[PDB]
């Protein structure tokens, strides 16, 4: 019984994720995604400045 | 018989914990864990303020 418990604990050590860091990374990457969308939207407007010169 | 009783009492003195102290340490560490969870939840929000600037 103890050996099987140790084996299960070792599997969990190998594969289980640490969600405490994931909670911070999730919000950080949501903010990153919002800024990336806004920056790409700004970059889409480069051609509009040409029309003013004509 | 008296010597065996003395030896058992000696092992108990040398290993056994006094659970009245852990009766308080349990509650203190439960409160401290809740406080740490609260503080970590506050800390993960540090990146949220960037969206307001853009």
Curated annotation (Swiss-Prot), chains A, B:
Protein's recorded name: Flagellin FljK
Subcellular location: Secreted; Bacterial flagellum
Top-level taxon of the source organism: Bacteria
Record-stated family: Belongs to the bacterial flagellin family.
Function: Flagellin is the subunit protein which polymerizes to form the filaments of bacterial flagella.
Subunit field text: In C.crescentus, the flagellar filament is composed of multiple flagellins of 29 kDa; 27 kDa and 25 kDa.
């Amino acid at each position: 019984g103890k050996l099987q418990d140790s084996l299960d604990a070792g599997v969990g050590n190998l594969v289980d994720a640490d969600l405490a860091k994931e909670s911070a990374k999730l919000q950080s990457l949501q903010t990153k995604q919002q800024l990336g969308v806004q920056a790409l939207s700004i970059a889409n407007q480069s051609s509009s400045s040409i029309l003013s010169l004509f």
